[PDB]
């Protein structure tokens, strides 16, 4: 069938949410781009550039009004009239991230806030920042934009969470149509806007080291892989993600095995999860 158009806007992001997507195994990113979505705008990988790239996005947006998916990577900074994040220029006007989300957000089928920055504010919104870094849902709400938002957090998210959420939406839409399908997606989000298939389970209660935790057997050095990592800073108890099962990068490792969980999918990351290396 016809692949839905996607525009991928980067605000105060690090491109790590884009890179993590490139690591998708099944399906491969090649299959995602050629068979699953039509990625019409993405500043890191698209052919065209500048005002022409912006105008192409605008033409597609008009043609597919209400039907395109808008991915946001990074937070949206509201201070200084949006000047901490300029994303383009067209018609001799600078376009801030603020301007862009106000332009495209109202006409999207849905906004996918990919990564903790976009979902919750993340590192750019953390203590010591001064750009007014704002999460997607808060920004849209503050601006009266009612478009459905799905949060796919993590710093970065696992590619399976991103692709899987797109597929959840596509399955629901095939069965129910666009509005109806997106309503079915919203019903499987938790109170933080996250899809329960990927974020409905707790790391700690499913952790292979739980028996050691219960026995009070704690590693005193990172390279001791027998003990529980709690004293080293592990935030598994406060974290809702399925990393314990799918693991990372083709299943070769994950944070708790290698070091500690830093709770990167949680709304209070990083400050509520810091210091990282103490309980």
């Amino acid at each position: 069938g016809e692949r839905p158009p996607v525009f991928w806007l980067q605000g105060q992001g690090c491109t790590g949410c884009s890179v993590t997507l490139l690591n998708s195994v099944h399906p491969s990113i090649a299959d995602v781009l050629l068979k699953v979505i039509s990625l019409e705008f993405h500043p890191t990988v698209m052919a065209w550039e500048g005002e022409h790239a912006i105008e192409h996005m605008r033409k597609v947006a008009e043609k597919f009004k209400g039907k395109f998916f808008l991915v946001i990577e990074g937070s949206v900074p509201v201070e200084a009239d949006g000047k901490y994040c300029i994303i383009g220029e067209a018609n001799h006007h600078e376009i801030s991230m603020v301007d862009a989300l106000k332009e495209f957000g109202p006409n999207a089928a849905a906004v996918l806030a990919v990564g903790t920055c976009a979902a919750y504010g993340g590192i750019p919104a953390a203590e010591g920042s001064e750009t007014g870094a704002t999460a997607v849902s808060k920004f849209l709400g503050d601006n009266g934009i009612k478009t459905p938002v799905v949060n796919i957090p993590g710093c970065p998210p696992h590619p399976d969470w991103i692709v899987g959420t797109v597929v959840l939406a596509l399955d629901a839409i095939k069965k129910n149509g666009l509005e109806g399908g997106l309503a079915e997606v919203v019903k499987v989000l938790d109170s933080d806007g996250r899809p329960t298939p990927f974020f409905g389970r707790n790391i700690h209660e499913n952790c292979p080291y739980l028996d050691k935790y219960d026995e009070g057997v704690m590693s005193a050095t990172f390279t001791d892989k027998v003990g529980c990592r709690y004293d080293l800073g592990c935030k598994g108890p406060m974290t809702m993600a399925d990393c314990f099962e799918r693991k990372w990068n083709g299943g070769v490792n994950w944070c708790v095995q290698n070091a500690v969980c830093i709770g990167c999918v949680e709304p209070d990351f990083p400050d509520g999860k810091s210091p990282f290396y103490q309980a």
């Binding site: 491969s28 090649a30 590192i123 750009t131 290698n258």
Partner: protein, 481 residues
């Protein structure tokens, strides 16, 4: 007439960049680069447990996070007086080295290659400039596309390599002050080596040959983009624990002369950057980051670093020029066969061809090949089962600096600790050296200068402007942080 062309966003780079050039009689005669996004890691880091830095700083950039991880942990090692075990040093090199492979492959195929290669008739490979100057034959173009597709798999395998001892990627968990968090087992070393073999085959058989081969259809691109012809390398990849030998040795090259690198000669200017005027001209040990987004005359969030007053470039060309290694067997052969050039060491390309648009792509391919030997060496040197980390207490008062080479160029992190918390943290990154604006005396940044002379014979299709910029593999997330 004088034509002003503004390109915002410059695509197929990392991060937010606007380029504005003036074209007169078919050539660029002036240029300004604007990094348009700021987060302010240097202020966000203040007040934190210093051990947190080696996680926080990675979020500067999800393409090069291992470089920031490395610089941070080196700075923290120095500040904490942590003595990283020999096996931990080698493990860190395996983690970081694998991302060099990922980053260079990503850059040439997924960022740069569409400059020369027409992709399939579907987004995001169309639409594009009506006259894109795509010169390859049907066969060679298809090889480009097939290798772009193969390279998507290969770069992903590079990140599996990173994650084996790094935990996950982007944003590794496995490097901390004191070493590496996971001792390599015999089993996981077999897994690393099996993946490494595939990446090596791709680099040797596809990547290096295709850069020379495409280069040979764009020989005019070796005659432009020289800029200042001045380069910086701060050293990277310690090869012993004495700290005396590195895979890339430090040095500076300018006006045809080689000289040692002295970090005390770095100063960061801000006249044309959106920061408070009173913070101009500071060495990183006394660096300050005070944003001034409304400041008259400024046009970028990138500060302007100068080395003893010089505007320098960094990256694979800089490192390969400074270190002047032997060229790959592939390179020697194709330089002869396709270019009629006889060359043994990198500098045998000559200054003009090396410091050129296509020269910088060649340098990056050659460096990728060079890194293969380094990683192979580390896989022989590493000892399965030997401890990789120490667990040092946090100091109340300390400072430290970590120097390394990110895939895009020279990187340093400086930390000052007071009352057991980060008092100051300053970052001077690779793309900061390349993509910066004018300094206080009006001297352009390296890429700005390299744009001068670039041909624009068709102002409606000014493709060579971004082609030059992409040769430097710009990363504006790093440049601004």
């Amino acid at each position: 007439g004088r034509t002003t062309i503004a390109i915002d966003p410059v695509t197929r780079i990392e991060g937010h960049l606007k380029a504005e050039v003036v074209v007169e009689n078919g050539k660029v005669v002036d240029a300004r680069l604007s990094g348009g996004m700021y987060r302010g890691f240097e202020t966000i880091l203040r007040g934190r447990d210093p051990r947190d830095a080696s996680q926080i700083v990675q979020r500067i950039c999800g393409v090069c996070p291992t470089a920031h991880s490395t610089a941070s942990v080196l700075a923290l090692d120095e500040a904490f007086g942590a003595k990283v075990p020999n096996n931990g040093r080698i493990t860190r090199n395996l983690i970081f080295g694998a991302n060099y492979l990922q980053s260079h492959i990503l850059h040439f195929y997924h960022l740069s290659a569409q400059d020369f290669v027409q992709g399939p008739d579907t987004a995001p490979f169309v639409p594009r400039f009506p006259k894109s100057d795509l010169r390859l034959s049907k066969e060679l173009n298809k090889a480009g596309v097939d290798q772009y597709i193969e390279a998507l798999e290969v770069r992903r395998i590079c990140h599996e390599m990173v994650a084996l001892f790094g935990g996950r990627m982007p944003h590794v968990q496995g490097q901390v002050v004191g070493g590496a968090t996971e001792i390599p087992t015999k089993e996981k070393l077999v897994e690393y080596a099996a993946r490494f073999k595939k990446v090596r085959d791709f680099v040797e058989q596809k990547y290096v040959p295709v850069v020379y081969t495409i280069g040979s259809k764009y020989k005019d691109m070796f005659k432009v983009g020289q800029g200042f012809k001045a380069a910086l390398c701060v050293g990277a990849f310690p090869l012993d624990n004495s700290g005396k030998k590195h895979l890339f040795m430090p040095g500076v090259y300018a006006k045809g002369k080689d000289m040692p690198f002295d970090p005390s000669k770095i100063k960061e200017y801000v006249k044309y950057s959106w920061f408070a005027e009173e913070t101009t001209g500071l060495n990183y040990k006394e660096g300050k980051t005070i944003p001034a987004p409304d400041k008259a005359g400024a046009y970028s969030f990138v500060k302007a670093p100068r080395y003893d007053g010089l505007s320098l470039e960094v990256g694979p060309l800089a490192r390969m020029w400074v270190n002047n290694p032997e060229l790959s067997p592939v390179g020697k052969k194709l330089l002869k066969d396709l270019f009629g050039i006889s060359a043994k060491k990198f500098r045998d390309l000559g200054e003009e061809a090396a410091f050129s648009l296509m020269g910088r792509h060649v340098a990056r391919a050659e460096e990728t090949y060079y890194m293969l030997g380094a990683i192979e060496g580390w896989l022989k040197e590493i000892k399965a089962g030997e401890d990789t980390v120490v667990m040092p207490a946090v100091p109340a008062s300390a400072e430290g600096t970590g120097f390394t080479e990110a895939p895009r160029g020279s990187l340093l992190h400086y930390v000052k600790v007071k009352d057991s918390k980060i008092d100051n943290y300053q970052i001077v990154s690779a793309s900061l050296w390349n993509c910066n604006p004018r300094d206080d005396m009006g001297q352009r940044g390296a890429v700005e200068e390299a744009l001068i002379g670039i041909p624009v014979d068709d102002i409606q299709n000014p493709v060579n402007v971004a082609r030059l910029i992409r040769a430097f593999d710009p990363x504006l997330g790093c440049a601004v942080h």
